[PDB]
Amino acid sequence: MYSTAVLLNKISPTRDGQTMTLADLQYLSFSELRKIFDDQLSWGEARHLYHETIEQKKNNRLLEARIFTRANPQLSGAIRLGIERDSVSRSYDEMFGARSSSFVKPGSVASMFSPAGYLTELYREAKDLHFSSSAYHLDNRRPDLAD
């Protein structure tokens, strides 16, 4: 019932002179979005932006999976006879180079499913569970973690 372009305009800019994008709200919960933008957004508008952000998050995850599935070197492959390269696949390779083909064996630190990847996700979300003023802040009790 709202237009996401207008709602992004009502919050723009995102303190860096850019049109606040849906990807910038990956990122924070609905409570965070309603609290931070309590002045510019109504309850319905906050719900609309949060829902649209999640759907954008899911679609981008699917698009990355679609590209990696066909770029997998393991499927060449008698199954390669029935595999076609999408036009979006070529556009991805022009932009990111050999990233789509840089597969790693399981157990490598570079994998997205490695313990390092799990540690990155834990640190990203648990970083802001306390304010910087609190001695219970993660970067205050253990300053070594960030480095």
């Binding site: 990956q26 998050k57 699917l62 008698a78």
Partner: protein, 488 residues
């Protein structure tokens, strides 16, 4: 202590001074405030698709400035609409096709495949689970015609920054404006061809007939005589393309017209005569179609495999995939996969990630069903070899080697690790950086519609992201085959 509501542009405010029925006892314990009926003039609401929001806020602040409590909420106001062009109605053609129509759009409601399965079932089930049965045509959804459209290769000079295209319909019902009819993406290597169905009724087409035009953003070919115009000729009793080329005089819905120009945007537009569309694996009957042609053969394959009936299991899995091809009319068929939705990669689930469901993801990208079926065939071959290996005779050992070699030839050569050594080790805060996450998501969003790569290469030092990982199940297949061949 105020209650404030917003109805479009108007803002009503009620405070404790004026609109309180009875003030509560002044104490540190519960202080329940009850208000008089709040009268709201809701006449400036922005009704988008017959629904408009009403914002209500409860707020109480102390003289300190502290918010003692704030609650925001939004109310949905829905407009009743029983206009005939906005009311769903159901029709049934004489051929047996049932469709539901909402304005211009018609959606098929039933299926007629059951009657044609009887003759196939007179022979063996080998005749039911074929590509021919999966391409059987459906009767059209009432009066209308099928039109063939061809679109060009992607051209940034002509189309613009993004490769998407929208096709709109014109003079239908009473609306003279553009209504969305079809959407898709241009290809950077070849043209894209489609066949759309345009509905018809007596008096349904307006002046000069219906329009079907294509837009790209940075251009939208809907000026005079730029879209394709069609009309129904009462004399010939057939549909005619009005502007296939320039015409100094031509017949249209409103009689003869003078200056007819060819359509623009499309490479070619024509009328498909006597064309019936094959059944859609994304229709309301998609669930039953998929079960009949994919899900059931795979279930029979698995159960027979679990009971070690290898030869019978192969017959069932060959209904969907066979590396040696499929014999149709005494010839090897041109298609690779005998299951039609897999060969055409037909998605039939738009929201796979709404819940944790592996099948939903595979329905969104049926490519994963190709891999799943392929791995099942590898499972059968290895199990065949293992059982032959255990018979210990020379003929059994030779049979075991044959199965293992065939499995290895289907897999190919297993790849090396390519990205591990080039990976720069980041800091924990660097990998969890919000700027890195936002930048990558920006590229993915842009790629999902366009493909703009201004300053193409992304400056390898601009990466702190992780890399894709090989499938551990496939590497286990290669590991098993290496060990079996070594022992033999």
């Amino acid at each position: 202590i105020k209650i404030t509501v917003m109805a479009g542009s108007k803002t009503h405010t009620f405070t404790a001074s004026d609109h309180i029925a009875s003030l509560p006892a002044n104490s540190f314990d519960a202080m329940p405030y009850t208000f008089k009926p709040l009268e709201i003039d809701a006449s400036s609401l922005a009704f988008t698709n017959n629904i408009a929001p009403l914002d209500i806020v409860f707020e109480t602040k102390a003289k300190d400035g502290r918010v003692l409590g704030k609650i925001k909420q939004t109310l949905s106001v829905k407009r009743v609409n029983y206009n005939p062009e906005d009311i769903l109605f159901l029709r049934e053609t004489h051929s047996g096709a049932q469709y539901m129509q909402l304005g211009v759009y018609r959606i098929r409601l039933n299926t007629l495949l059951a009657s044609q399965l009887v003759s196939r079932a007179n022979t063996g089930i080998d005749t039911i689970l074929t590509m021919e049965t999966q391409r059987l045509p459906e009767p059209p959804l009432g009066e209308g015609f099928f039109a063939n459209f061809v679109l060009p290769k992607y051209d940034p000079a002509e189309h613009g920054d993004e490769r998407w295209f929208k096709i709109h319909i014109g003079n239908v019902g009473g609306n003279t404006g553009r209504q969305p009819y079809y959407s898709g993406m241009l290809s950077d290597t070849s043209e894209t061809s489609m066949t759309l169905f345009v509905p018809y009724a007596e008096g349904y087409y307006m002046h000069e007939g219906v329009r079907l035009g294509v837009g790209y953003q940075k251009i939208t070919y809907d000026n005079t005589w730029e879209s394709a115009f069609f009309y129904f000729d009462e004399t010939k009793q057939q549909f005619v393309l009005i502007n296939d080329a320039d015409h100094d005089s031509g017949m249209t819905q409103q009689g003869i017209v003078k200056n007819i120009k060819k359509y623009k945007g499309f490479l070619n537009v024509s009328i498909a005569t006597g064309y019936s569309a094959p059944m859609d694996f994304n229709s309301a009957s998609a669930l039953y179609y998929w079960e009949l042609f994919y899900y059931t053969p795979m279930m029979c394959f698995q159960r027979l495999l679990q009971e070690k009936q290898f030869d019978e299991a192969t017959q069932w899995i060959n209904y969907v995939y066979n590396p040696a091809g499929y014999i149709v009319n005494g010839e090897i068929a041109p298609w690779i996969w005998n299951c039609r939705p897999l060969e055409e990669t037909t998605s039939w689930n738009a929201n796979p990630l709404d819940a944790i469901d592996p099948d939903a993801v595979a329905q969104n990208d049926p490519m994963h069903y190709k891999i799943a079926t392929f791995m099942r065939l590898l499972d059968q071959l290895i199990l065949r070899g293992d059982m032959a290996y255990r018979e210990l005779t020379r003929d059994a050992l030779n049979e075991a080697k044959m199965w293992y070699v065939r499995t290895l030839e289907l897999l190919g050569d297993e790849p090396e690790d390519y990205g591990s050594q080039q990976w720069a080790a980041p800091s924990l805060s660097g990998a969890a950086s919000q700027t890195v996450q936002a930048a990558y998501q920006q590229d993915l969003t842009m790629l999902g519609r366009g493909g703009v790569s201004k300053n193409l290469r992304t400056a390898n030092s601009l990466v702190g992201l992780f890399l894709p990982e090989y499938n551990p199940a496939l590497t286990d297949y290669w590991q098993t085959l290496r060990l079996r061949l070594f022992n033999l």
